[PDB]
Amino acid sequence: ESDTGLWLHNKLGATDELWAPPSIASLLTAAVIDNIRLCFHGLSSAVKLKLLLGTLHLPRRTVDEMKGALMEIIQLASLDSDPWVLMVADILKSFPDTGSLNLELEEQNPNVQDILGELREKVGECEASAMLPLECQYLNKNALTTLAGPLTPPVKHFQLKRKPKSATLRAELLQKSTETAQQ
Amino acid sequence: IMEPSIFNTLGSPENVIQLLSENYTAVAQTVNLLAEWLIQTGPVQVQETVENHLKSLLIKHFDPRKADSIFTEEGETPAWLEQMIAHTTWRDLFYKLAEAHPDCLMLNFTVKLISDAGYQGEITSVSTACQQLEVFSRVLRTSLATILDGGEENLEKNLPEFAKMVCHGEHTYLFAQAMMSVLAQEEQGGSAVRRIAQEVQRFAQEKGHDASQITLALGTAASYPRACQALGAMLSKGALNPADITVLFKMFTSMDPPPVELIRVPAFLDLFMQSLFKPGARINQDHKHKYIHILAYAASVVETWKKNKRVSINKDELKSTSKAVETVHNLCCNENSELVAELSTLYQCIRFPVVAMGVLKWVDWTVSEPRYFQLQTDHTPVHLALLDEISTCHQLLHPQVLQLLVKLFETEHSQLDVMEQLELKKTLLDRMVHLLSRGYVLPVVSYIRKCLEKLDTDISLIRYFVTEVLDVIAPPYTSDFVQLFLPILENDSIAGTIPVTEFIAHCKSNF
Amino acid sequence: SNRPVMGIVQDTLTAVRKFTKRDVFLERGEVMNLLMFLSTWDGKVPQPAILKPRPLWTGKQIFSLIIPGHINCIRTHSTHPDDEDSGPYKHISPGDTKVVVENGELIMGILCKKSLGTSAGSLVHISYLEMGHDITRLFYSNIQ
Amino acid sequence: AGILFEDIFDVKDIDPEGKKFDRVSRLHCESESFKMDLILDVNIQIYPVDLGDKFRLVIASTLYEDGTLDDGEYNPTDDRPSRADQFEYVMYGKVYRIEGDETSTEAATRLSAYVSYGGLLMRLQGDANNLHGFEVDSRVYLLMKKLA
Amino acid sequence: KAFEKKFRFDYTNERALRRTLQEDLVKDVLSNAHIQNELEREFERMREDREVLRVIFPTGDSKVVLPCNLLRMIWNAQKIFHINPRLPSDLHPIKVV
């Protein structure tokens, strides 16, 4: 870092992409984030978001031993002016502690409360009729029934007059399988 | 002109002749006259084409330039814009006008008011929604309500317009992974929304989006450094490194259970699916035993999560699923034929659910390989009979079974003879009708309706499909099913060539 | 068939493929020896591709000297992947398999039958089309 | 002073697609002063570049400090000084294509400069202003020295 | 749509046309009704040529055998005259017509 503000303004100041690069981990060393203590408010909204979103990629052991600096950085983000930064800061306020995030908004952004509220009964009204998690596809019958309740059976769109042709060929592969196995 | 005419009590002399041109003369008189005349000539289309003529001329204006310096807008522009946004073509136009010049205080300030004033569903909001908090939360509420009442089919339709909004940046993604996770953690319908969350995570995995760092901390799986650090390298790298599997094996086996949802992540189990069920994956004995143990552990145990305590474990069904996965692993890796001889136990393994998508992926990596159908000689290949049994035993894999099977149906095998190409298509249609008997009705017939009405596939295959369907089904019929099936027989490219009488007799009674 | 009837063959073709590879670096004396088998050479030794640590020329420079005037060509090497022209590195070949001659200079690419044989649009074909016949005769002889 | 480009580069890749050539390895390098991606093909067989090496890359149209132009002819017995004296890897070539993110009515802000050194290619992507000196069909010298 | 986008000269977008041409040529193209009419007539003539080609080749192969290689000739003209593609040109489109 020749000048930290300008250097992050080149690396994370690309207005074209708000992505975070895979090389961000080498950029976010302790010697870099330590220098951002002095000059953080003058930095733009996009660089602040990309920097805070870069905290996720760092592993647990390289963060928790030095959690205080991150706690100070997110506290400095708690006083910011961009609402996106403010809300993620109030969400990421417990990331470097153990990784168990705040996972609730009842102190900032009063308008999202009605967003939660209007979906809160609608989700209950359409509990199992909406969709079933992909994890339960692999889980057995007892595990699926205990996890998300019993399966919803198919609607009887029609009756049947005789079995399809697949039954005969399935029986034929069974009888062939047994004779070839015994032979 | 209308304004530059008599500036003073005359006022230029040239402008007084310009006043004669417009004023309250032809420019105004004939406007009402021709507005009633084009109406009387034929007409509600007149006002629509009038508005179209205005709308084309509107777009030339330089809205982002003059609107920035005012900084006030007299209190949210009540004089002219507030009545304007209530007009359909104008409010739709405003979204188009915003895209030309983003990053402006005036446009982003004004759009926050129209979103809650009647435009709850903000169309074409791919980028505009990202900038503003209120509009993003509002359209997220609309999206989550729409997907919740849409059912199952709409998930294909709901994915692209909604999930692409978080592609601009990650800041729009973790927030879009926050409130619905709170809705998922509750016992009142918490499964379906975590389902769409994991679906979004999987789309992120196939669009290159990094979702390996946020979903682990969101399911409170970050409580242990070893578990989070172990799983992070697996999901980030995308491989089964032995160190993380060994620590997980010695961890979960002890009397200290991690959260069960971390080992049940669909991206992790799909990674196991890809790593293990591939025919070309060669693993030593010990690591294979640990892999099959992890899958069995991830698919057998019932646990009571009281948020501080849990005392529950099952070992027998873990052993049974370990045996099934191991035996199917042996069949998949050996590959040699003696394949037919192994169906005595293979269908027993088909009865287990965790194995069904394993053999499904194995079949996908087998049949998609070219010349496989050319190399095959049976009237019905054994792999497709395995998918028939998969369709019979279970119903959760039916979207995946149909997706693989239509992927095969649309495929062209140029190396094959044309008649065997048709007989292969008829075999795939035999799987269609088999799956139709197993409850997957509407998506299959929707595929057929698309393939016939829109595409130009062979009509013989459609005729074979309709004949098999009519010969296998019997009344009663639901109104949606006859609503979907009846236009096929009314196409008249099929009806004159050959159940049909019974169906047309019953359908008229139905509707 | 409106294509050149005669082209570079056998020993010259294999050796020019081995010569135009990106890894071929010629010492000074080797460059001196090769430069004087050029009948169309202007006598000015080109600046080396690598100046330091050691002066090394590449076979592309020498073949640029062989190619006459300012003919322009794009040709595709036999081992060229198809997907290379779709993804990144499309115009900076990791395999050096895209042949482009600009201002009569082989800026990149490895030469084969597709660019020096009898096929239409090859280097000898456009050399004949743009520079008459005697210049192309000298081109053939200089290559060999 | 004839310098079109100057930077300190770090390299974290060595032939990601695989070893295409024994004597040449593609170098995916990343800048440390600005935002700038460099793809480079070097002669490792005489100048071995290990992973994580710090090297100062300079693009100059003339090696000579005074700025007099070079004729593109080898002249080892030259008596003038050069910028090649302080740097330990110098290689000369031309630039065959400049690309950018320009639209029909917006300027390119992310330029790309494809430069070929006798068949050894180099691509240099990044911001337009630092690349603004590069122009097509111009001979340049790739100057490099390895830092610590 | 692609043919119109890639082959019809547009004299209504001042910004992009100023990007690709010198300002005096921009003024001459915009002011003249005659030049714009001639350019549109050329476009309609090449549209007629397009439908004639579609009549001639019902199979959609564009490969034909014609005397002068125009693409290589334009490349040669670019290289000989040291054409800078980044800069705007001094070539009047009506001169091309």
GROMACS .gro file of C-alpha atoms in nm, chain B residues 184-510:
model
  327
  367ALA     CA    1  -3.731  -2.078   0.774
  368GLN     CA    2  -3.606  -2.120   1.132
  369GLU     CA    3  -3.965  -2.111   1.260
  370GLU     CA    4  -4.169  -2.431   1.266
  371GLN     CA    5  -4.461  -2.262   1.084
  372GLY     CA    6  -4.383  -2.346   0.721
  373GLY     CA    7  -4.009  -2.315   0.760
  374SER     CA    8  -3.922  -2.584   0.507
  375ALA     CA    9  -4.043  -2.442   0.172
  376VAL     CA   10  -3.864  -2.110   0.208
  377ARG     CA   11  -3.538  -2.275   0.309
  378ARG     CA   12  -3.604  -2.491   0.001
  379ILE     CA   13  -3.609  -2.188  -0.227
  380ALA     CA   14  -3.308  -2.052  -0.034
  381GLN     CA   15  -3.104  -2.367  -0.104
  382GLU     CA   16  -3.229  -2.354  -0.464
  383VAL     CA   17  -3.094  -1.998  -0.489
  384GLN     CA   18  -2.768  -2.123  -0.335
  385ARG     CA   19  -2.745  -2.398  -0.598
  386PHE     CA   20  -2.812  -2.149  -0.881
  387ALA     CA   21  -2.533  -1.942  -0.725
  388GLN     CA   22  -2.312  -2.251  -0.740
  389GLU     CA   23  -2.383  -2.297  -1.112
  390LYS     CA   24  -2.344  -1.925  -1.195
  391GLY     CA   25  -2.003  -1.905  -1.030
  392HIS     CA   26  -2.145  -1.709  -0.737
  393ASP     CA   27  -1.967  -1.763  -0.406
  394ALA     CA   28  -2.225  -1.904  -0.166
  395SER     CA   29  -1.985  -2.125   0.031
  396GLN     CA   30  -1.903  -1.863   0.296
  397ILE     CA   31  -2.244  -1.726   0.398
  398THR     CA   32  -2.480  -2.026   0.415
  399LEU     CA   33  -2.266  -2.199   0.679
  400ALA     CA   34  -2.280  -1.907   0.921
  401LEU     CA   35  -2.653  -1.866   0.850
  402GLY     CA   36  -2.748  -2.216   0.969
  403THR     CA   37  -2.552  -2.150   1.294
  404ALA     CA   38  -2.299  -2.410   1.178
  405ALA     CA   39  -2.015  -2.170   1.264
  406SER     CA   40  -2.042  -2.263   1.634
  407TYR     CA   41  -1.745  -2.501   1.596
  408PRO     CA   42  -1.417  -2.394   1.429
  409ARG     CA   43  -1.338  -2.747   1.308
  410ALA     CA   44  -1.674  -2.809   1.139
  411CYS     CA   45  -1.690  -2.473   0.961
  412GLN     CA   46  -1.323  -2.483   0.859
  413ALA     CA   47  -1.361  -2.841   0.735
  414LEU     CA   48  -1.672  -2.776   0.526
  415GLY     CA   49  -1.545  -2.443   0.392
  416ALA     CA   50  -1.257  -2.596   0.198
  417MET     CA   51  -1.487  -2.863   0.053
  418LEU     CA   52  -1.752  -2.623  -0.073
  419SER     CA   53  -1.499  -2.361  -0.192
  420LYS     CA   54  -1.265  -2.606  -0.367
  421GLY     CA   55  -1.535  -2.841  -0.493
  422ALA     CA   56  -1.377  -3.177  -0.416
  423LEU     CA   57  -1.365  -3.445  -0.146
  424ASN     CA   58  -1.030  -3.376   0.020
  425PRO     CA   59  -0.954  -3.654   0.271
  426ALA     CA   60  -0.865  -3.436   0.572
  427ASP     CA   61  -1.208  -3.277   0.609
  428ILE     CA   62  -1.384  -3.611   0.563
  429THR     CA   63  -1.164  -3.770   0.831
  430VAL     CA   64  -1.227  -3.493   1.087
  431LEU     CA   65  -1.601  -3.500   1.009
  432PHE     CA   66  -1.602  -3.880   1.048
  433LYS     CA   67  -1.433  -3.868   1.387
  434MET     CA   68  -1.640  -3.565   1.493
  435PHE     CA   69  -2.000  -3.660   1.419
  436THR     CA   70  -1.947  -4.017   1.545
  437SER     CA   71  -1.874  -3.879   1.894
  438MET     CA   72  -2.137  -3.779   2.149
  439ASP     CA   73  -2.144  -3.414   2.046
  440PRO     CA   74  -2.377  -3.370   1.748
  441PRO     CA   75  -2.330  -3.073   1.516
  442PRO     CA   76  -2.641  -2.907   1.370
  443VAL     CA   77  -2.802  -3.164   1.143
  444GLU     CA   78  -2.874  -2.908   0.869
  445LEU     CA   79  -2.504  -2.852   0.796
  446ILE     CA   80  -2.452  -3.214   0.688
  447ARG     CA   81  -2.782  -3.201   0.496
  448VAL     CA   82  -2.684  -2.911   0.269
  449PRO     CA   83  -2.801  -2.997  -0.087
  450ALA     CA   84  -2.486  -2.853  -0.246
  451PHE     CA   85  -2.274  -3.079  -0.024
  452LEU     CA   86  -2.476  -3.391  -0.106
  453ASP     CA   87  -2.476  -3.305  -0.477
  454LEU     CA   88  -2.098  -3.273  -0.446
  455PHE     CA   89  -2.093  -3.620  -0.293
  456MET     CA   90  -2.318  -3.736  -0.578
  457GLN     CA   91  -2.073  -3.605  -0.840
  458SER     CA   92  -1.763  -3.728  -0.659
  459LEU     CA   93  -1.887  -4.081  -0.581
  460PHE     CA   94  -2.144  -4.199  -0.842
  461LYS     CA   95  -1.916  -4.110  -1.134
  462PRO     CA   96  -1.791  -4.433  -1.299
  463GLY     CA   97  -1.437  -4.292  -1.331
  464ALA     CA   98  -1.387  -4.211  -0.961
  465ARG     CA   99  -1.123  -4.436  -0.805
  466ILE     CA  100  -1.091  -4.427  -0.425
  467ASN     CA  101  -0.908  -4.650  -0.178
  468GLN     CA  102  -1.097  -4.879   0.061
  469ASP     CA  103  -1.070  -4.668   0.378
  470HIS     CA  104  -1.175  -4.334   0.230
  471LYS     CA  105  -1.463  -4.507   0.051
  472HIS     CA  106  -1.582  -4.652   0.382
  473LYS     CA  107  -1.570  -4.304   0.536
  474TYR     CA  108  -1.761  -4.158   0.238
  475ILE     CA  109  -2.040  -4.416   0.255
  476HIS     CA  110  -2.053  -4.367   0.632
  477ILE     CA  111  -2.098  -3.989   0.589
  478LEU     CA  112  -2.380  -4.035   0.336
  479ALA     CA  113  -2.548  -4.292   0.556
  480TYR     CA  114  -2.506  -4.063   0.858
  481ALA     CA  115  -2.647  -3.775   0.650
  482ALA     CA  116  -2.957  -3.978   0.560
  483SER     CA  117  -3.054  -4.198   0.854
  484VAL     CA  118  -3.065  -4.027   1.192
  485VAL     CA  119  -3.366  -3.854   1.346
  486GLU     CA  120  -3.269  -3.570   1.580
  487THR     CA  121  -3.466  -3.342   1.815
  488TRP     CA  122  -3.319  -2.990   1.799
  489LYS     CA  123  -3.405  -2.812   2.126
  490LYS     CA  124  -3.151  -2.533   2.046
  491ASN     CA  125  -2.933  -2.628   2.344
  492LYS     CA  126  -2.969  -3.008   2.378
  493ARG     CA  127  -3.024  -3.312   2.157
  494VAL     CA  128  -3.030  -3.682   2.251
  495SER     CA  129  -3.116  -3.903   1.952
  496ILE     CA  130  -2.920  -4.137   1.724
  497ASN     CA  131  -2.986  -4.432   1.494
  498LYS     CA  132  -2.726  -4.688   1.385
  499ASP     CA  133  -2.910  -4.977   1.216
  500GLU     CA  134  -3.063  -4.780   0.927
  501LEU     CA  135  -2.724  -4.610   0.889
  502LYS     CA  136  -2.571  -4.956   0.841
  503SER     CA  137  -2.840  -5.059   0.591
  504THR     CA  138  -2.794  -4.743   0.383
  505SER     CA  139  -2.415  -4.789   0.407
  506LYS     CA  140  -2.456  -5.138   0.260
  507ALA     CA  141  -2.684  -5.010  -0.017
  508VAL     CA  142  -2.451  -4.723  -0.111
  509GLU     CA  143  -2.148  -4.956  -0.098
  510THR     CA  144  -2.311  -5.219  -0.321
  511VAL     CA  145  -2.425  -4.958  -0.573
  512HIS     CA  146  -2.072  -4.814  -0.559
  513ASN     CA  147  -1.938  -5.158  -0.648
  514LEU     CA  148  -2.183  -5.191  -0.937
  515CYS     CA  149  -2.108  -4.838  -1.061
  516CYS     CA  150  -1.729  -4.869  -1.042
  517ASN     CA  151  -1.690  -5.230  -1.163
  518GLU     CA  152  -1.896  -5.157  -1.480
  519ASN     CA  153  -1.852  -5.521  -1.595
  520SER     CA  154  -2.125  -5.780  -1.880
  521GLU     CA  155  -2.303  -5.915  -1.568
  522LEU     CA  156  -2.492  -5.584  -1.539
  523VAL     CA  157  -2.824  -5.765  -1.593
  524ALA     CA  158  -2.735  -6.018  -1.321
  525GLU     CA  159  -2.705  -5.745  -1.057
  526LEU     CA  160  -3.069  -5.629  -1.065
  527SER     CA  161  -3.165  -5.883  -0.796
  528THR     CA  162  -3.026  -5.649  -0.528
  529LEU     CA  163  -3.010  -5.327  -0.732
  530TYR     CA  164  -3.388  -5.275  -0.714
  531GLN     CA  165  -3.364  -5.338  -0.338
  532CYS     CA  166  -3.117  -5.049  -0.335
  533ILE     CA  167  -3.363  -4.857  -0.556
  534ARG     CA  168  -3.616  -4.881  -0.272
  535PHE     CA  169  -3.383  -4.670  -0.057
  536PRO     CA  170  -3.423  -4.300  -0.145
  537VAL     CA  171  -3.060  -4.183  -0.099
  538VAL     CA  172  -2.950  -4.427  -0.372
  539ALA     CA  173  -3.213  -4.317  -0.626
  540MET     CA  174  -3.047  -3.992  -0.730
  541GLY     CA  175  -2.711  -4.173  -0.718
  542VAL     CA  176  -2.811  -4.422  -0.986
  543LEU     CA  177  -2.997  -4.141  -1.164
  544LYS     CA  178  -2.675  -3.939  -1.193
  545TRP     CA  179  -2.488  -4.257  -1.288
  546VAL     CA  180  -2.744  -4.322  -1.564
  547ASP     CA  181  -2.711  -3.959  -1.675
  548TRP     CA  182  -2.334  -3.994  -1.705
  549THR     CA  183  -2.386  -4.325  -1.888
  550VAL     CA  184  -2.660  -4.256  -2.147
  551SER     CA  185  -2.541  -3.901  -2.229
  552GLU     CA  186  -2.213  -4.052  -2.346
  553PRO     CA  187  -2.251  -4.085  -2.726
  554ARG     CA  188  -2.281  -4.422  -2.904
  555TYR     CA  189  -2.431  -4.577  -2.588
  556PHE     CA  190  -2.763  -4.622  -2.767
  557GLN     CA  191  -2.570  -4.732  -3.075
  558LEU     CA  192  -2.388  -4.986  -2.858
  559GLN     CA  193  -2.717  -5.096  -2.700
  560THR     CA  194  -2.928  -5.366  -2.862
  561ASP     CA  195  -3.220  -5.435  -2.626
  562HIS     CA  196  -3.578  -5.337  -2.699
  563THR     CA  197  -3.557  -5.150  -2.368
  564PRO     CA  198  -3.217  -5.067  -2.214
  565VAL     CA  199  -3.173  -5.174  -1.852
  566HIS     CA  200  -3.083  -4.819  -1.744
  567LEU     CA  201  -3.422  -4.690  -1.854
  568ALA     CA  202  -3.593  -4.976  -1.670
  569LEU     CA  203  -3.400  -4.855  -1.364
  570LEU     CA  204  -3.553  -4.510  -1.415
  571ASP     CA  205  -3.893  -4.677  -1.445
  572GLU     CA  206  -3.841  -4.838  -1.105
  573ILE     CA  207  -3.714  -4.503  -0.967
  574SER     CA  208  -4.034  -4.338  -1.092
  575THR     CA  209  -4.240  -4.617  -0.936
  576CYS     CA  210  -4.083  -4.624  -0.590
  577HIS     CA  211  -4.053  -4.249  -0.528
  578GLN     CA  212  -4.203  -3.920  -0.642
  579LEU     CA  213  -3.960  -3.650  -0.523
  580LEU     CA  214  -3.715  -3.732  -0.805
  581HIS     CA  215  -3.986  -3.693  -1.070
  582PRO     CA  216  -3.878  -3.339  -1.178
  583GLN     CA  217  -3.520  -3.466  -1.204
  584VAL     CA  218  -3.629  -3.785  -1.382
  585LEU     CA  219  -3.830  -3.583  -1.633
  586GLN     CA  220  -3.546  -3.332  -1.681
  587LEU     CA  221  -3.301  -3.612  -1.763
  588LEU     CA  222  -3.556  -3.786  -1.980
  589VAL     CA  223  -3.651  -3.481  -2.189
  590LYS     CA  224  -3.276  -3.409  -2.213
  591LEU     CA  225  -3.253  -3.752  -2.376
  592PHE     CA  226  -3.566  -3.697  -2.587
  593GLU     CA  227  -3.443  -3.370  -2.738
  594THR     CA  228  -3.100  -3.524  -2.801
  595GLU     CA  229  -3.003  -3.616  -3.156
  596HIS     CA  230  -2.792  -3.930  -3.195
  597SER     CA  231  -2.666  -3.879  -3.550
  598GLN     CA  232  -2.452  -4.195  -3.538
  599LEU     CA  233  -2.765  -4.412  -3.503
  600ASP     CA  234  -2.994  -4.536  -3.779
  601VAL     CA  235  -3.307  -4.333  -3.838
  602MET     CA  236  -3.549  -4.613  -3.753
  603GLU     CA  237  -3.363  -4.700  -3.433
  604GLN     CA  238  -3.368  -4.325  -3.363
  605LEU     CA  239  -3.748  -4.334  -3.376
  606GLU     CA  240  -3.765  -4.655  -3.169
  607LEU     CA  241  -3.541  -4.486  -2.910
  608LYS     CA  242  -3.780  -4.190  -2.901
  609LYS     CA  243  -4.073  -4.431  -2.856
  610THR     CA  244  -3.881  -4.592  -2.568
  611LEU     CA  245  -3.847  -4.250  -2.407
  612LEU     CA  246  -4.219  -4.196  -2.460
  613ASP     CA  247  -4.277  -4.530  -2.287
  614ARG     CA  248  -4.098  -4.374  -1.991
  615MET     CA  249  -4.321  -4.065  -2.026
  616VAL     CA  250  -4.639  -4.275  -2.002
  617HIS     CA  251  -4.490  -4.477  -1.715
  618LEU     CA  252  -4.419  -4.155  -1.526
  619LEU     CA  253  -4.770  -4.036  -1.611
  620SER     CA  254  -4.904  -4.336  -1.418
  621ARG     CA  255  -4.683  -4.240  -1.121
  622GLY     CA  256  -4.850  -3.901  -1.070
  623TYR     CA  257  -4.627  -3.667  -1.274
  624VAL     CA  258  -4.906  -3.558  -1.508
  625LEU     CA  259  -4.909  -3.184  -1.571
  626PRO     CA  260  -4.536  -3.115  -1.646
  627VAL     CA  261  -4.514  -3.408  -1.890
  628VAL     CA  262  -4.826  -3.311  -2.083
  629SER     CA  263  -4.706  -2.949  -2.074
  630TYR     CA  264  -4.383  -3.067  -2.239
  631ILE     CA  265  -4.586  -3.254  -2.502
  632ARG     CA  266  -4.807  -2.950  -2.565
  633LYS     CA  267  -4.498  -2.734  -2.614
  634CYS     CA  268  -4.333  -2.995  -2.838
  635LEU     CA  269  -4.640  -3.030  -3.061
  636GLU     CA  270  -4.806  -2.687  -3.077
  637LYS     CA  271  -4.482  -2.485  -3.096
  638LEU     CA  272  -4.200  -2.715  -3.203
  639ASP     CA  273  -4.190  -2.930  -3.515
  640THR     CA  274  -4.103  -3.272  -3.376
  641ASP     CA  275  -4.234  -3.585  -3.546
  642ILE     CA  276  -4.611  -3.627  -3.526
  643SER     CA  277  -4.578  -4.007  -3.503
  644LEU     CA  278  -4.422  -3.976  -3.157
  645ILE     CA  279  -4.708  -3.752  -3.042
  646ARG     CA  280  -4.958  -3.999  -3.188
  647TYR     CA  281  -4.788  -4.288  -3.006
  648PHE     CA  282  -4.798  -4.081  -2.687
  649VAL     CA  283  -5.169  -4.004  -2.714
  650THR     CA  284  -5.255  -4.364  -2.805
  651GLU     CA  285  -5.060  -4.501  -2.507
  652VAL     CA  286  -5.210  -4.242  -2.271
  653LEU     CA  287  -5.569  -4.307  -2.380
  654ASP     CA  288  -5.517  -4.682  -2.365
  655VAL     CA  289  -5.364  -4.669  -2.015
  656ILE     CA  290  -5.595  -4.418  -1.842
  657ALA     CA  291  -5.963  -4.443  -1.753
  658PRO     CA  292  -6.221  -4.188  -1.629
  659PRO     CA  293  -6.289  -3.993  -1.403
  660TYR     CA  294  -6.078  -3.699  -1.519
  661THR     CA  295  -5.994  -3.368  -1.359
  662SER     CA  296  -6.087  -3.047  -1.538
  663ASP     CA  297  -5.726  -2.928  -1.567
  664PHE     CA  298  -5.609  -3.256  -1.718
  665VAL     CA  299  -5.882  -3.260  -1.984
  666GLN     CA  300  -5.814  -2.886  -2.036
  667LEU     CA  301  -5.453  -2.974  -2.117
  668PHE     CA  302  -5.508  -3.299  -2.310
  669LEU     CA  303  -5.805  -3.200  -2.529
  670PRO     CA  304  -5.626  -2.948  -2.763
  671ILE     CA  305  -5.386  -3.229  -2.860
  672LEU     CA  306  -5.667  -3.439  -3.005
  673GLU     CA  307  -5.833  -3.131  -3.158
  674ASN     CA  308  -5.517  -3.055  -3.361
  675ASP     CA  309  -5.665  -3.292  -3.628
  676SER     CA  310  -5.318  -3.397  -3.744
  677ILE     CA  311  -5.363  -3.697  -3.511
  678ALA     CA  312  -5.738  -3.765  -3.484
  679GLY     CA  313  -5.796  -3.882  -3.842
  680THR     CA  314  -5.523  -4.147  -3.821
  681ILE     CA  315  -5.696  -4.376  -3.567
  682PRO     CA  316  -6.038  -4.487  -2.643
  683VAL     CA  317  -6.063  -4.185  -2.877
  684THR     CA  318  -6.443  -4.216  -2.893
  685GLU     CA  319  -6.458  -4.282  -2.518
  686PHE     CA  320  -6.241  -3.978  -2.444
  687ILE     CA  321  -6.439  -3.740  -2.667
  688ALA     CA  322  -6.763  -3.877  -2.519
  689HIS     CA  323  -6.644  -3.817  -2.162
  690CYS     CA  324  -6.473  -3.479  -2.218
  691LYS     CA  325  -6.790  -3.304  -2.335
  692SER     CA  326  -6.963  -3.429  -2.019
  693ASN     CA  327  -6.666  -3.298  -1.819
   0.00000   0.00000   0.00000
